[model samples]
Target: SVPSQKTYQGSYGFRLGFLHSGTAKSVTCTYSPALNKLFCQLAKTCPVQLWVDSTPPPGTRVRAMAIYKQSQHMTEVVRRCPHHERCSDSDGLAPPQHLIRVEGNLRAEYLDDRNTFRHSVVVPCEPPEVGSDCTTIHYNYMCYSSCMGGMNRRPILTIITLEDSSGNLLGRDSFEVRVCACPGRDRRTEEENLRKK
Candidate 1:
């Protein structure tokens, strides 16, 4: 099944003092103009879990973290910071920019103190006539992951094309693959994830 959402969890802070939140209560994040990226982590260690829809508006460009480890040699794990809108505070300033949030568990894939794995899923947006130079197709969509001490890097990617943008598939093929974390949810696929609907 094609996932209705895309996830981009990355690391931002380093060598900072550590503390815990007073409570587990939900909180909001503020935008950082100093850096092109939005600031979600605060005085303490905050998880980064961003859920973006499969269809993003045109002209939107955000630097998302692709999957990788924080150290050399694929060891250690990565965390996800809560999603924040680009360029503005979480107060929903007029129109939202940057990180558009979708629905899903804020929890991210926890990396352990072992070899971390990095993967990429590239889907084609817009018709072929739009060309590849469009920011929507080129920049807005990317894949990043993280681990422990390894600089959190991105690996060389192999582009996989989809028979249809929608994730509803009936059978598996050598062409592309979609892994659904929630087997219950309806994800599209060129092939089906189950025997029957």
Candidate 2:
């Protein structure tokens, strides 16, 4: 008969990016060589959205560490509720390096935005009006994951860790990226997708 794929709608899945095959199409992003994934803006300045199975409780605070610099008062946050990848590129260039390490929280209640945290739960990656130039989905993966992302920007890894009241590292995730623009596709796509099925 038929097979049906499931989706949580605009949830998290993979990392990376690419612009559609035209003047304009998808998200705004820059490249990070270290992580070899696309550092994309799910929304305005919305960094990346990370998804995990589960996290520790108390859901109180988050600590963000910017190994290089910040515009988000990161050092103080790094003193808060404590917390915490893999993958590479195809260019055979042994990946890139870092200048300013970027990190943040996916959990809004514990997220660090402009040195301030949010109390309400928000969906960061909601679709921005489905349309053509839809370099979106040809095989079920997100548009960003499939297109060609460039490694022009310095190596940037967005790291986010979970913390409780006393600042103990619970769970965490980090991401890498490159700038995304139109007329892009995975070069050599010399990559593999992971699955548990």
Candidate 3:
């Protein structure tokens, strides 16, 4: 079946794909949303594709999206995908600055079934450093070094858990965190632009 139509601020728009051939198809697009936004699942399968959009985004498309197939929804498509829009652009100038960063790993302790506390280990991961430059009239002299000028937290590995009455490994979760950083403006042209002025 095909994706459903979407409504935005009272505007209606259709989703971009359908499933067939026993396999899955996918596409990507840009999207922005507050961290708390949520969307319904399409059938029982995963959403089609994944995408990223807005500033602090890779490249400067100002938008992006990924479309994929839902195998289970093959015959019955009842799920929906809701998109949330969040803009950091502040008047088409000075887009929100972002930095690419890696987070540190950490261990956490929590209660187990017997009411005893136990330690859980977490793995560590980090994003490698990146440097880039862009000269566009949209923003003047934009640049954010690693960790967004220290506004970002370092990489981290955190372990969270809970124990049941039996003190067995009732529940446990671990995750890695990374920071994102954007680059500054190009220098070669700026130098020449300075000379001309």
Candidate 4:
């Protein structure tokens, strides 16, 4: 799960999700905001591979997967390899990795649960900050306007993507949310009614 809400449309709780190959009982993970990484713990006996949905660029061997093992902190743990195979070279050495960032306009689309299109907006990525590996972008109510009225709440289907400098997709994810329409603003139909009267 990526951050699904564009500001002002408040969403509670941190957002994120991962794909794993280990059994439910043998693997567990949690997000650490301070570290900006998700940590996973597996039963020493269980070996697992996990990855986010995005794929690396063509010809790149990187699988976006991280492999982990267990130790005494969990007790009776039979620890194994900590080195990630998918993240390493054929010779078992770590390979060089590039951070092809999402440049220029980052597009986000809103849809209804039935896969009907609703609205779309482009948000620019924040410029890199000094001494930091990543920047920030802010989206508030102003980024999107709602003109549909009837129900107080509706399910929002969201798709967000990161694109490279050439406008090629780098990564993307989709998620759903239940939210309300912006209060008292249905300008599209209001203007239409005015014209007819």
Rank candidates by lDDT, best first.
2, 4, 1, 3
Scored by lDDT, the top model is 2
Point out the worst 10-residue segment of candidate 3 by lDDT: 135-144
List the global CA lDDT of all models: 0.23, 0.28, 0.20, 0.26
The root-mean-square deviation over C-alpha atoms between each candidate and the true structure, in angstroms, is 20.3, 16.0, 23.5, 23.0
| TM-score per candidate, chains pooled | 0.20, 0.32, 0.16, 0.27
Q: Where is model 1 more than 4 Å wrong at Cα?
A: 1-27, 41-116, 119-197
Q: Candidate 4's residue-wise lDDT over 39-103, tens digit each?
A: 22311111111123333343221111111111211121111123321333222211112101112
| Candidate 3 Cα errors over 4 Å, as ranges | 1-154, 164-169, 181-197
lDDT by residue (1-197, candidate 2, tens digit) is 11111122122222223332222235344333322444443122333333333333433333333221233332321111111002332122111121122223232222234333221122122232455211121111012322223112223333444444665444444444332333123311312222221
lDDT, residue 16, candidate 2 = 27
Looking at model 1, residue 151 earns an lDDT score of 22
Ranking by TM-score: 2, 4, 1, 3
Task: Supply the TM-score for candidate 1.
Answer: 0.20
- lDDT of model 3 at position 19: 20
Q: Is candidate 1 or candidate 4 better by lDDT?
A: 4
* Residue lDDT tens for model 3, 66-184: 11223342232111111111223322321132111111212111112132221111111112235522211110111111223231222222222222233333233222212122101
